[PDB]
Amino acid sequence: MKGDIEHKVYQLLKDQGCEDFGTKCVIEEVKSSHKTLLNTELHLTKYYGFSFFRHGNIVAYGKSRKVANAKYIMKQRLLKLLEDKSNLLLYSCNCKFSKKK
Numbered sequence: 001m002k003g004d005i006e007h008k009v010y011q012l013l014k015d016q017g018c019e020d021f022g023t024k025c026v027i028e029e030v031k032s033s034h035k036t037l038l039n040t041e042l043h044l045t046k047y048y049g050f051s052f053f054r055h056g057n058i059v060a061y062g063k064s065r066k067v068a069n070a071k072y073i074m075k076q077r078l079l080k081l082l083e084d085k086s087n088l089l090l091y092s093c094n095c096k097f098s099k100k101k
């Protein structure tokens with residue numbers, strides 16, 4: 001496929017009978033500051049903790065100072081999973097019914 005990992009994730013997962021998934025974007029600031037001279041560190045060295053959630057689990061993780069790089073990492077995570085067919089993102093679940101081995 002090409003490009004947008006989110007669409008790929010949706011394309012198959014929603015078709016597997018899943019709707020419970022999505023990306024989370026929380027900032028993980030690296031506090032190298034012991035004390036400071038203002039209320040809070042106006043702007044310290046923070047990192048965008050991009051991650052992909054699937055049933056409360058972490059399928060993709062990519063923390064970077066650059067939003068693009070952060071996204072890039074997590075994207076290539078699930079990207080490899082749908083390419084390699086690793087069940088970490090693509091496993092069957094009960095958003096519809098039971099499963100069969």
Ligand SMILES: [Zn+2]
Nearest residue numbers: 018020093095
């Ligand atoms: Zn599900």
